[PDB]
Amino acid sequence: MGFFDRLKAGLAKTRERLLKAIPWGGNLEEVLEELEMALLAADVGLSATEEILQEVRASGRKDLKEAVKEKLVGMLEPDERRATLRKLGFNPQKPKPVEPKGRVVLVVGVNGVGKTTTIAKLGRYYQNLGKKVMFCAGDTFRAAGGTQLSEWGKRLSIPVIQGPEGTDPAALAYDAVQAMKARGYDLLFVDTAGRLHTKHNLMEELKKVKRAIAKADPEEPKEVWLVLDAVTGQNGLEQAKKFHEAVGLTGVIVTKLDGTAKGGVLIPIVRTLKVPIKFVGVGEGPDDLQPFDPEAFVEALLED
Numbered sequence: 001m002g003f004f005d006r007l008k009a010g011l012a013k014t015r016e017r018l019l020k021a022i023p024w025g026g027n028l029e030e031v032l033e034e035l036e037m038a039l040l041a042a043d044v045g046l047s048a049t050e051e052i053l054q055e056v057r058a059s060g061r062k063d064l065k066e067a068v069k070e071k072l073v074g075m076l077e078p079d080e081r082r083a084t085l086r087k088l089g090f091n092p093q094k095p096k097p098v099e100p101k102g103r104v105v106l107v108v109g110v111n112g113v114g115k116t117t118t119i120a121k122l123g124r125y126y127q128n129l130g131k132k133v134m135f136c137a138g139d140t141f142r143a144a145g146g147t148q149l150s151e152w153g154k155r156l157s158i159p160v161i162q163g164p165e166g167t168d169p170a171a172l173a174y175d176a177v178q179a180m181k182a183r184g185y186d187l188l189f190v191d192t193a194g195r196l197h198t199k200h201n202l203m204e205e206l207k208k209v210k211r212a213i214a215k216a217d218p219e220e221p222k223e224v225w226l227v228l229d230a231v232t233g234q235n236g237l238e239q240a241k242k243f244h245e246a247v248g249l250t251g252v253i254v255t256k257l258d259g260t261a262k263g264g265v266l267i268p269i270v271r272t273l274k275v276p277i278k279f280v281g282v283g284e285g286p287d288d289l290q291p292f293d294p295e296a297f298v299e300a301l302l303e304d
């Protein structure tokens with residue numbers, strides 16, 4: 001319960017079509033059939049679905065339902081260690097806290113996916129874990145109404161490195177790291193432009209920003225997080241590929257899970273990018289941005 005409730009609520013649209021209604025009592029032939037449709041309807045994809053079936057049908061010689069759960073969780077965990085600790089019984093009440101590998105987190109993704117809002121929630125999250133957090137408003141470009149990262153910073157008391165619209169994004173991020181160092185901050189999130197059809201090639205700007213961060217601190221950024229909208233589609237995964245090829249993702253944040261019945265998309269995402277989902281977005285609330293936990297996610301896909 002508690003956050004678990006918020007997760008189940010966020011996955012309700014995906015869950016209540018067929019997943020929860022699966023008749024785990026009938027003769028396999030029916031159940032597995034219903035299972036394949038439920039998966040495909042949730043956007044798990046044919047590839048991962050036919051593998052799940054194999055894993056269960058061929059193998060899966062334990063409890064039918066549990067076999068499914070274990071297989072789905074296995075598909076969501078890119079890290080062998082955690083997969084192992086899980087199999088060994090590790091299953092704490094609430095998911096462990098996501099610790100950035102370093103001090104700088106470069107945030108990327110296409111315009112509109114919710115990068116700005118996601119960073120603000122991340123600031124809160126980390127602040128509540130006692131980190132001194134700083135923001136860099138690397139997307140000086142587009143504002144057009146909405147709420148700037150700049151306004152979010154004042155509200156959380158998080159300083160925002162920013163410059164006049166048009167300011168060199170790379171020089172901003174450089175100043176941002178310098179500032180984070182001199183003032184002794186624990187974490188810096190660098191927001192970035194997300195428009196793929198301007199006169200300035202997005203991927204190239206991005207690489208110039210990551211390079212600037214490195215010039216300031218040769219170890220950074222230790223995290224490159226792509227934000228993906230669960231409502232987009234497979235084009236968004238293709239874009240993901242380009243972002244990965246351009247800057248090397250270390251993680252993925254999936255937002256707007258509450259707005260779709262295709263939440264099963266997380267499986268294809270992790271299988272394609274082979275990086276972990278760090279946080280999942282279950283709504284437009286402050287604490288709606290939660291640390292990802294495969295076990296919990298899978299449970300919410302099937303239960304409640």
Ligand SMILES: Nc1nc2c(ncn2[C@@H]2O[C@H](COP(=O)(O)OP(=O)(O)NP(=O)(O)O)[C@@H](O)[C@H]2O)c(=O)[nH]1
Nearest residue numbers: 111112113114115116117118255256281282283284
């Ligand atoms: N329902 C839902 N909405 C979300 C989630 N995350 C972000 N959003 C919403 O998505 C919209 C775009 O957010 P924003 O942070 O402005 O996006 P951007 O990707 O930063 N766009 P811009 O380039 O215009 O600054 C907002 O209305 C925001 O609340 C989520 O997990 N669920």
